[PDB]
Homo-oligomer: A and B are copies of this chain.
Amino acid sequence: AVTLPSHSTRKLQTRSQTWLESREYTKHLIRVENWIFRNPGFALAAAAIAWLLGSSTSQKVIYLVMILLIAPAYS
């Protein structure tokens, strides 16, 4: 269907390799890189929401990272 759960929630940690462990490190990162690379105005919009939301400068960057993480996968 549409909402198949990823098995990487419950990865069988053992000595041998799992099924898709080669393409797991750059699995989410390719999608975030593509979604930011093809929607560059959301970088500005999320920067604005982070800078209006955070109190310190060390929390605005966390808000910026978390919104530019949420919006590729749409949670």
Name A residues whose Cβ lies closer than 8 Å to a Cβ of B: 1-3, 5-6, 8-9, 20, 23-24, 26-28, 30-32, 34-35, 38-39, 53, 55-56, 59, 62-63, 66-67, 69-70, 72-75
Known: A2-B27, A66-B70, A72-B75. 20 other contacts (CB 8 A): A1-B23, A2-B20, A2-B23, A3-B31, A3-B34, A5-B34, A6-B74, A8-B74, A9-B38, A28-B74, A31-B75, A32-B75, A53-B59, A53-B62, A55-B59, A63-B66, A66-B66, A69-B70, A69-B75, A73-B74
Q: How many monomers of this chain does the complex have? A: 3
How far does the Cβ of A20 sit from chain B's closest Cβ, in whole Å? 7
